[PDB]
Amino acid sequence: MIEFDNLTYLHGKPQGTGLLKANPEDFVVVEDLGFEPDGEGEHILVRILKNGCNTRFVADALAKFLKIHAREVSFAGQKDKHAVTEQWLCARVPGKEMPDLSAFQLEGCQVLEYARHKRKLRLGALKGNAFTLVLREVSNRDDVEQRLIDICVKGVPNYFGAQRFGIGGSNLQGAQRWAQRNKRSFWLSAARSALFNQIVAERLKKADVNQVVDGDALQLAGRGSWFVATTEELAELQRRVNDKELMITAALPGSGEWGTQREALAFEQAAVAAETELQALLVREKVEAARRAMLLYPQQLSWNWWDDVTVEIRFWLPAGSFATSVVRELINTT
Numbered sequence: 001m002i003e004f005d006n007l008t009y010l011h012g013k014p015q016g017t018g019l020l021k022a023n024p025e026d027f028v029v030v031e032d033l034g035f036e037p038d039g040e041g042e043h044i045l046v047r048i049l050k051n052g053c054n055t056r057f058v059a060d061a062l063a064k065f066l067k068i069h070a071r072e073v074s075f076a077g078q079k080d081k082h083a084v085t086e087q088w089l090c091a092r093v094p095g096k097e098m099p100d101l102s103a104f105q106l107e108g109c110q111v112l113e114y115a116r117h118k119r120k121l122r123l124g125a126l127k128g129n130a131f132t133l134v135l136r137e138v139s140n141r142d143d144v145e146q147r148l149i150d151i152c153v154k155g156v157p158n159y160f161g162a163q164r165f166g167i168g169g170s171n172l173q174g175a176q177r178w179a180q181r182n183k184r185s186f187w188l189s190a191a192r193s194a195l196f197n198q199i200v201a202e203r204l205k206k207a208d209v210n211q212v213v214d215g216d217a218l219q220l221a222g223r224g225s226w227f228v229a230t231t232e233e234l235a236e237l238q239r240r241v242n243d244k245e246l247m248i249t250a251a252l253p254g255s256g257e258w259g260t261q262r263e264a265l266a267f268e269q270a271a272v273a274a275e276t277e278l279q280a281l282l283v284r285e286k287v288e289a290a291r292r293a294m295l296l297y298p299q300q301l302s303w304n305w306w307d308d309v310t311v312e313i314r315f316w317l318p319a320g321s322f323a324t325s326v327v328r329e330l331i332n333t334t
Contacts, residue, residue, distance in 0.1 A: 011154070028083070211238070
């Protein structure tokens with residue numbers, strides 16, 4: 001298996017270093033539901049700024065303040081103390097009164113806004129996240145500037161970041177050992193994600209990383225739907241890919257059809273051909289194969305150098321894409 005650090009670079013490996021997330025204020029994430037609260041219904045959505053604790057800790061304290069059971073507070077995913085997050089929480093409190101959520105106090109947290117909403121927030125349901133990060137001790141400004149320019153144009157690889165593989169690589173290691181419930185889920189997720197990263201690393205070795213081939217699975221920008229390239233539509237499909245209307249995808253292997261056909265499917269199979277044990281694990285466990293865009297086009301990418309060795313970068317990414325995957329193409333952090 002290709003190691004994370006050896007994953008192919010779109011812009012080539014950076015010619016300089018810096019510091020990411022040196023303090024929580026250098027890494028600010030604003031969650032994006034994709035909608036405004038209904039303004040009615042049995043749930044209270046509450047946007048809380050948090051700095052210095054995890055998502056479960058705040059949700060426990062919100063439960064207690066509302067005098068409801070802990071299970072009645074839900075969110076998108078659990079986020080540690082190492083970044084600043086404006087995170088959405090969701091409390092079931094029947095009726096049509098509004099509790100004074102502005103009087104809820106907890107160290108390092110701020111209640112920002114709240115409103116009723118009809119449906120529960122569930123794990124993984126965000127549209128995306130808007131990031132504000134400060135990269136410090138940047139060794140090569142000229143290199144980072146050019147890379148930012150080139151990212152506007154070409155994007156970055158849409159890799160799963162190191163976080164997906166658990167601390168120390170443990171989730172992938174666990175997958176590899178098992179291929180010979182919370183843990184089960186993390187292991188399967190690591191396995192399929194590692195395979196996706198590998199197929200992208202291989203595809204990036206082609207002369208033209210955005211060349212559409214016959215059988216490719218092309219996804220519409222900004223949603224899940226995808227369809228299969230054919231030879232007679234290729235010049236037209238190529239144009240749409242070049243114009244960032246369509247996204248060439250790579251497999252998340254699993255049971256059923258991976259979704260590519262003909263030459264593209266042969267390529268995806270060959271790219272992970274030695275990984276028969278992880279493939280069989282996923283099939284056995286009925287983890288349906290899926291598609292994921294190969295590239296990532298950070299939205300509203302903006303930046304500002306405060307001096308020759310400090311830059312503040314902003315962008316928005318869809319749910320399931322990583323800020324570290326953008327930063328991997330700017331600076332070396334190992």
